[PDB]
Design a protein around this nucleic acid. Structure first.
Ligand SMILES: [C]O[C]1[C]([O])[C]([C]OP([O])(=O)[O-]P(=O)([O-])OP(=O)([O-])O[C][C]2O[C](N3[C]=[N+]([C])C4=C3N=C([N])[N]C4=O)[C]([O])[C]2[O])O[C]1N1[C]=NC2=C1N=[C]N=C2[N]
Ligand SMILES: O=c1ccn([C@@H]2O[C@H](COP(=O)(O)OP(=O)(O)OP(=O)(O)O)[C@@H](O)[C@H]2O)c(=O)[nH]1
Ligand SMILES: [Mg+2]
Ligand SMILES: [Mg+2]
Lengths: 50, 1208
RNA sequence: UUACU
């Protein structure tokens, strides 16, 4: 198959042992409405709508 | 074919048919003058180029191959290049071009007749060009140059590398090599007279740069910038230009470390484990930025402008602390070729050992006491540079007089008059009147004392050797200029001995009188690794320049007061040819002689101090007898390491008493002085430390010393080992692989490969690619070290050929009139380069039967009985456990040729050549000589040590020869019979005994397997779950804690996975060798320590008895016992392995650290030592197979006979 | 032809 280049896999063990932190979430603007992030599916697909 | 289209050059490993190709090509390329000329010089390789590449980093670089006209057609002789004075007394003083100027071979010739001084000049300059140019370590000159250039084909797989273009353009004449060396007639004899005189050095420069290309220090395009700089040095004088570049071309990193600026480094703890990493910003302070402006002007004009342009890119492009380390080791190998700088020593007498007076005169002591002759007996200093030194040193005279009191010196005389060497004398007319055997013995120190054993108590013995002139020994180093040192005879060695014993006991008293090099590993630097890791420190590392010269007689006197002032408070009766008596002593501020009571130490020291003759007198083949103008330090006396240690310790420590005397602080931390290398450490603000750093310079400047000048924030050197930022930089070029100039203990033997294995292990943490260095050591191991030449006799020449040609080819040689010995040389096949007893070198992956290959043996592989496992490793160990057999494949070992190599092991040629030399000398003549030696010493009951050695062996088991005392009286005599020769009558009965050894072992051979090995056949099985990585690995992730320990390499991961270095082991080993002759690598063999432990662990109630076979004192007994009890956790005597601490600097000593890495299912714990034996199994296979370590954890399976063997 | 730590 692939298996990559044991130098690059020796730094794989070094990578997944000493992990770190990122991803600051601030942007952060004025919104004079309702800030919608998720949608909701209906709980019961019951009726046809002929 | 040829060596760049082989299957081994592609894989890069040993397929079963690929190994027959490497046998066939190297043996063909070994023993031909012609084939060699084919390989270096086919017409199929293009001329190269305007080449471009990447100079060992991310960026790119281009350079052109330029050859100057001073090499392609050199000038004529120009006899104003080596002028004389108005008389022919000496060379003209202040002459330049003191070394061998490149002048084109032909022009030197004799014209005129065998006298009239100038004839001996042109004859000895011919000895400079034809004799003092070659120094080939293993093979001849051409086999060695072919060993890089073949290995550099196999590694990079092509022939478009541009080093071979320098091989082609510098020398090619189309029929044969431009020059070869004779061996039998000893000179380099030329075949083209129009070729340059300097070219036999350029073999070794092309040798060294290709070693640096292979090491990974230099890339291909960087070696263009290298080679152009070397040939530019060769325009007028190839070494005189190099010695001026040597200072400038490596002082430049302190600018590049300044420019990098903020650089993230590991830090160390007190007990040298890595505890943290911090980012510490390297900007060197304001007063060394003023030293940058003065130095970069000298960089611009003294250097070749392409070598200068390579440096100015490394200042500007460098971005990390790792990045300057890349350029610095690579710019360092551009200024050196490792060639030892050899000329005739009449040229270097003016440069090396002529005394200089740098600026000040040093004034004299107030003499307080004088004996009947007006000479110094007791003396004290008055407001000088010395009064600063005796403010520190005179406090020790009340304690050392109880340590210099309590040795009994006549005993310590015979133990320091070991190391057989020379006396000056050629004995004389009385060499006839002592005996013709002891005529030939008469070189050693222990023998020239034995011949004159009667004279040792007479005081006229020392008086008749002031008449004898001191002869100039010369010895040279890697980068220093041709240096001379004084070989004193036994009586001039005697007067210097009491100042050696007095100045020795300041070492145990003061730490800072410092480190002897017994560690080899990190403890020789574990001081320097710590203080650089710290904050608010500036580090200075001082060499004075030349420190043999500078020591005038007046500066020498500051050590003389310290040696006197100890000896007055002491009580030593008789010392030698003296006795404590009643002398007339003048007491200054008395009129009139008043008789003090003086002891022998007192008398001896006063006489030696008074009497001192300093000149070295060299007999010349040109001149009559040139004599150095005295006032230097004659550096061989006894105290040549203490006189420059005790002095500089008094001057720098005495400074912080004098600075504390007038209201200034001291602000100096620990200082390590191994004379002359001063290295002190400061702390405070950037202004306070500098006010002290000037006065340490200025008092050494007013002591008459030329301190060069070195200091920096985050830079520190000692014993030619650079430490910076908490990382270790290498100095790889100082270990020259291929230049020796020893003329003493030459091997072309098994021992010639031990000289490779010790130097290959010197470079394992000075290299950026240790796998490539294993490629280089293999072919030089293969091509060069291949042929052992032996002189048989004719009748036995027939069957010596027939028996050994059965297994491996033996060369035959053309027959002789009227010497009756034909030469013949055996060819020593490539398996012998891998044997446990032969060449102990680590291998490449072989092929099993199916064949799924072995593990690639890395640079950390341990030697002795482990290379016998490699024989079983080929036979599929995992398979063997399957069939439950100790059985062995004779097919696969005979196919590669392993079977033909262990025959050469069992022939045992080396001790057989030692046996015939041991056969010829009468032990009766030795015993009368050596009974007279124990008359000088003890006196009695050196007999009790011989009795203790013999009582131990007959009751128990053999304690061998060198170690126990009075045998090591006898063994110290033996070395002159070992020295004084092989020659031909003894050599004819070498062949009679060896041929009897041959016909017995050839009559059938099978691989002899021992009951003492079950004890490999264990193999590790990889699993699917990873290790932890030991949190100090995150700290040494950045940046470049050594050279090979870059992030994601083999040596870094071994320092991560195997991990650690304990302090607990190699402090006791650092405590052991303080008994037994410490100053270097001291690798673990130590035949006291292993032989004493095999009695201690298994056996000891006898262990009272062989301590007086050492004649170990009660203190000396206490050192060894603490090391024996700590060496009982690990490991086994039953399974032998040897590595060196030079091989594994930061890697752990202990197999305890590897038991974390391998589980053993605990039904295998089956004997009392068997936990401690399985650790070495876990210890070695991690270090052996580190290039194939994903970071999985391996698990051990065993053969049931290995379970069965350790049960007992 | 060849030193000491
Ligand atoms: C007894 O015997 C002996 C020995 O063996 C010897 C040695 O030899 P070798 O060295 O081995 O040779 P080599 O080196 O091998 O060679 P090569 O290198 O291979 O090649 C070669 C070459 O060489 C030459 N050659 C030269 N030279 C000079 C010579 C030669 N050869 C001969 N044979 N000779 C001579 O001289 C060429 O050229 C080429 O090229 O030795 C011996 N040894 C010797 N001698 C002696 C000895 N021992 C002791 N003693 C003495 N005297
Ligand atoms: O074989 C040796 C090598 C070195 N030494 C040691 O050499 C010291 C004196 O030699 P120096 O160390 O003072 O030479 P130098 O540095 O001033 O020369 P440059 O680098 O400036 O060119 C002595 O104090 C001693 O201990 C020997 O005694 N024997
Ligand atoms: Mg020095
Ligand atoms: Mg030095």
């Amino acid at each position: 198959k692939k298996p990559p280049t044991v130098v690059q896999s020796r730094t794989d063990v070094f990578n997944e042992q000493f992990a770190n932190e990122a991803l600051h979430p601030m942007t952060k603007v004025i919104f004079n409405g309702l800030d919608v992030n998720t949608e909701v599916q209906p709980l019961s697909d019951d009726f046809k709508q002929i | 074919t040829k060596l760049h289209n082989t299957i081994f050059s592609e894989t890069r490993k040993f397929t079963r048919e690929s190994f027959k190709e490497i046998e066939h090509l190297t043996a063909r390329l070994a023993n031909d003058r012609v084939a060699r000329h084919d390989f270096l010089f086919n017409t199929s390789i293009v001329l190269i180029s305007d080449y471009s590449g990447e100079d060992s980093n991310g960026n790119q670089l281009q350079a052109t191959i330029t050859i100057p006209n001073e090499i392609i057609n050199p000038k004529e002789y120009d006899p104003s290049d080596y002028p004389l004075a108005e008389d022919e007394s000496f060379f003209k003083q202040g002459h330049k071009y003191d070394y061998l100027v490149t002048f084109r071979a032909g022009s030197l010739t004799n014209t005129y007749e065998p006298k009239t001084k100038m004839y001996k000049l042109h004859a000895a300059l011919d000895k400079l060009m034809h004799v003092k140019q070659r120094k080939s370590r293993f093979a001849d000159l051409w086999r060695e140059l072919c060993a890089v250039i073949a290995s550099l084909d196999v590694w990079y797989q092509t022939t478009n590398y541009p080093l071979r273009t320098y091989v082609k353009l510098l020398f090619h004449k189309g029929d044969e090599f431009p020059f070869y060396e004779s061996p039998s007639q000893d000179r380099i004899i030329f075949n083209d007279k129009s070729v340059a005189s300097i070219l036999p050095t350029f073999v070794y420069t092309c040798c060294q740069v290709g070693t640096a290309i292979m090491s990974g220090i230099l890339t291909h395009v960087e070696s263009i910038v290298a080679m152009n700089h070397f040939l530019h040095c060769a325009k007028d004088s190839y070494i005189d230009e190099k010695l001026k570049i040597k200072g400038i071309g490596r002082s430049w990193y302190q600018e590049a470390l300044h420019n990098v600026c903020q650089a993230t480094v590991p830090v160390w703890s007190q007990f040298n484990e890595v505890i943290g990493h911090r980012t510490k910003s390297t900007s060197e302070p304001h007063f060394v930025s003023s030293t940058f402006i003065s130095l970069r002007a000298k960089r611009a004009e003294l250097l070749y402008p392409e070598f200068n342009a390579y440096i100015n890119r490394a200042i500007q492009l460098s971005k990390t602390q790792n990045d300057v380390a890349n350029y610095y080791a690579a710019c360092r190998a551009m200024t050196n070729d490792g060639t030892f700088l050899a000329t005739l020593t009449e040229l270097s007498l003016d440069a090396a050992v002529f005394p200089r007076i740098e600026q000040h005169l040093v004034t004299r002591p107030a003499v307080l006491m004088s004996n009947t002759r007006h000479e110094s007996l007791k003396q004290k200093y008055t407001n000088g540079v010395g009064s600063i030194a005796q403010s520190y040193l005179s406090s020790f005279t009340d304690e050392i007089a109880k340590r210099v009191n309590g040795r009994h010196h006549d005993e310590a005389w015979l133990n320091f008059l070991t190391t057989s060497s020379p006396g000056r004398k050629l004995t004389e007319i009385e060499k006839l009147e002592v005996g013709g055997d002891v005529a030939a013995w008469s070189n050693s120190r222990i023998v020239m004392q034995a011949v004159f054993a009667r004279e040792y108590r007479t005081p006229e013995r020392i008086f008749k050797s002031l008449k004898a002139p001191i002869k100039l020994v010369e010895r040279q180093q890697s980068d220093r200029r041709q240096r001379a040192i004084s070989g004193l005879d036994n009586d001039r060695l005697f007067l210097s001995f009491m100042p050696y014993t007095i100045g020795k006991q300041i070492y145990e008293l003061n730490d800072n009188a410092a480190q002897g090099k017994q560690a080899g590993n990190a403890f020789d630097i574990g001081e320097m690794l710590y203080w650089t890791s710290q904050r608010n420190v500036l580090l200075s590392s001082i060499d004075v320049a030349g420190m043999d010269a500078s020591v005038t007689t007046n500066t020498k006197d500051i050590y003389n007061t310290f040696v006197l002032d100890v000896a007055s408070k002491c009580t030593v009766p008789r010392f030698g040819p003296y006795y404590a008596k009643n002398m007339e002593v003048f007491e200054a501020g008395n009129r009139q002689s008043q008789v003090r009571y003086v002891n022998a130490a007192w008398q001896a020291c006063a006489l030696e101090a008074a009497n001192s003759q300093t000149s070295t007198s060299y007999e010349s083949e040109i001149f009559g007898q040139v004599k150095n103008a005295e006032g230097t330090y004659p550096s061989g006396r006894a105290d040549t390491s203490t006189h420059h240690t005790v002095l500089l310790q008094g001057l720098v420590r005495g400074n912080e008493l004098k600075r504390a005397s007038d209201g200034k602080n001291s602000c100096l931390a620990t200082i390590k002085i191994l004379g002359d290398d001063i290295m002190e450490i400061f702390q405070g603000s950037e202004s306070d430390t500098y006010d002290h750093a000037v006065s340490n310079a200025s008092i050494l400047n007013e002591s008459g010393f030329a301190t060069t000048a070195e200091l920096s924030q985050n830079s520190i050197v000692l014993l030619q080992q650079l430490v910076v930022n908490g990382t270790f930089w290498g100095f790889a070029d100082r270990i020259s692989l291929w230049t020796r100039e020893d003329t003493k203990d030459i091997g072309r033997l098994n021992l010639a490969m031990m000289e490779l294995n010790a130097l290959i292990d010197d470079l394992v943490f000075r290299v950026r690619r240790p796998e490539g260095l294993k490629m280089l050591g293999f072919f030089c191991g293969a091509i060069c070290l291949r042929r052992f030449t032996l002189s048989v006799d004719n009748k036995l020449y027939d069957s010596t050929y027939n028996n050994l040609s059965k297994y491996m080819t033996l060369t035959k040689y053309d027959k002789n009139p009227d010497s009756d010995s034909t030469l013949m040389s055996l060819i020593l096949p490539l398996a012998w380069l891998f044997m446990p007893r032969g060449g102990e070198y680590p291998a490449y992956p072989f092929e099993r039967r199916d064949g799924t290959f072995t593990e690639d043996e890395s640079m950390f592989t341990a030697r002795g009985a482990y290379k016998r496992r490699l024989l079983y490793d080929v036979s599929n160990i995992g398979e063997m456990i399957q069939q439950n057999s100790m059985a062995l494949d004779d097919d696969l070992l005979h196919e590669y040729g392993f079977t033909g190599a262990l025959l050469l092991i069992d022939l045992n040629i080396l001790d057989l050549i030692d046996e015939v030399k041991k056969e010829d000398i009468s032990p009766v003549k030795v015993s009368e000589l050596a009974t007279s030696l124990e008359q000088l010493g003890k006196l009695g009951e050196r007999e009790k040590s011989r009795r203790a050695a013999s009582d131990l062996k007959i009751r128990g088991h053999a304690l061998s020869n060198d170690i126990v005392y009075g045998y090591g009286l006898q063994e110290k005599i033996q070395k002159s019979a070992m020295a004084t020769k092989e020659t031909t009558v003894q050599s004819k009965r070498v062949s009679s005994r060896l041929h009897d050894v041959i016909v017995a072992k050839t009559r059938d051979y099978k691989i002899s397997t021992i009951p003492a090995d079950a004890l490999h056949l264990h193999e590790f099985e990889v699993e699917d779950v990873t290790v932890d990585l030991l949190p100090h690995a995150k700290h040494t992730s950045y940046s470049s804690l050594a050279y090979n320990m870059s992030f994601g390499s083999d040596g870094w991961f071994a320092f991560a996975l195997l991990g650690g270095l304990d302090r607990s082991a190699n402090l006791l080993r650092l405590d052991v060798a303080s008994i037994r002759g410490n100053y270097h690598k001291f690798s673990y063999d130590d035949p006291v320590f292993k032989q004493g432990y095999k009695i201690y662990k298994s056996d000891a109630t006898l262990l009272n008895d062989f301590f007086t076979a050492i004649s170990a004192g009660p203190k000396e007994q206490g050192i060894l016992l603490r090391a024996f009890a700590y060496y009982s956790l690990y490991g086994n005597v039953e399974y032998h392995y040897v590595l060196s601490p030079r091989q594994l600097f930061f890697l752990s000593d202990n197999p305890v650290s590897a038991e974390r890495l391998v589980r053993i299912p605990p039904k295998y714990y089956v004997s009392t030592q068997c936990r401690a034996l399985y650790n070495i199994f876990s210890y070695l296979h991690i270090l052996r197979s580190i290039a194939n370590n994903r970071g999985k954890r391996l698990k051990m399976v065993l053969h049931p006979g290995l379970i069965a063997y350790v049960r007992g």
